[PDB]
Design a binder for this molecule. Structure first.
Ligand SMILES: NC(=O)c1cc(Cl)c2c(Cl)c(C3CC3)n(CC3CCNCC3)c2n1
Length: 273
């Protein structure tokens, strides 16, 4: 049926739908229960059969196998007017947006650990043929006990492909200049641009660009003291020409990314575990 789950408080609502705290009754596992109205759903996909479902379900199934820094889909249900997704829920948890709101710009050692884990999660998605298309601090959860980050909300995502994309429903201030100007981008280089925005966000406490004109110009001004190596990596991710941007391999081999803390180290030093 679907009272295999006890429903708790509303955790949040927005373009992603309505998300409730929940518990799976069979083993007390913490879950998040996400309701999405069918009419409010834009991009659709389908499973290895008829079964037309939200793209989000297709993508999560493709990445939810195995361990990773991606939130796992435990189950889903269809109702007459909506879909309901059952997702794993860290506890205690705080999204990266709220974490940055409370603590301001992050020390580089902590930003390094977080950014590294985001890179590994995004690599996993791409390796599984999934492109997220809305990487940003609001879509990243922190498991405060373990110091492990989780990517959420694949509702703007798509199957990864090597040809040009001409559709985009992600967050605009995270979208690349080629999308702003031409409404065209390729998957990896757009993702790397958003990773540059995210890294700036972490070490400066706010995003670099607010307006189309700023994104198009691509001038990065640093409002906080940031190391030259970090500045260099960020400016590389934010290269105006897509082909001038680093690959994931080049990002992880960059001098700023060396000697990352383990997740548990991160929690003990910076999240006091
Ligand atoms: N797919 C989603 O949109 C989704 C998935 C999950 Cl597992 C969660 C969880 Cl947990 C939360 C609340 C713990 C913040 N939320 C609410 C969000 C947390 C980050 N942005 C603010 C509301 C979740 N949302």
């Amino acid at each position: 049926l679907e009272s295999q789950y006890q429903v708790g408080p509303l955790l949040g609502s927005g373009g992603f739908g309505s998300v409730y705290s929940g518990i799976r009754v069979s083993d007390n596992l913490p879950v998040a229960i996400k309701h999405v109205e069918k009419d409010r759903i834009s991009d659709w996909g389908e499973l290895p059969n008829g079964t037309r479902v939200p793209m989000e379900v297709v993508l999560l199934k493709k990445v939810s196998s195995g361990f990773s820094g991606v939130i796992r889909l435990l189950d889903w249900f269809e109702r007459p007017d909506s879909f309901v997704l059952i997702l794993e829920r860290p506890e205690p948890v705080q999204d990266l947006f709220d974490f940055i709101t409370e603590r301001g710009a992050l020390q580089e050692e902590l930003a390094r650990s977080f950014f590294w884990q985001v890179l590994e999660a995004v690599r996993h998605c791409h390796n599984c043929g999934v492109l997220h298309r809305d990487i940003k601090d609001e879509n990243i959860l922190i498991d405060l006990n373990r110091g492990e980050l989780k990517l959420i909300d694949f509702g703007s995502g798509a199957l990864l492909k090597d040809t040009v994309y001409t559709d985009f429903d992600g967050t605009r201030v995270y979208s690349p200049p080629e999308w702003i100007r031409y409404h065209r981008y390729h998957g990896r280089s757009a993702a790397v641009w958003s990773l540059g925005i995210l890294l700036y966000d972490m070490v400066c406490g706010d995003i670099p660009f607010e307006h189309d004109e700023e994104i198009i110009r691509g001038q990065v001004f640093f409002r906080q003291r940031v190391s030259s190596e970090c500045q260099h990596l960020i400016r590389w991710c934010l290269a105006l020409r897509p082909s001038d941007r680093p690959t994931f391999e080049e990002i992880q081999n960059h001098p700023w990314m060396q000697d990352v803390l383990l997740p548990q180290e991160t929690a003990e030093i910076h999240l006091h575990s």
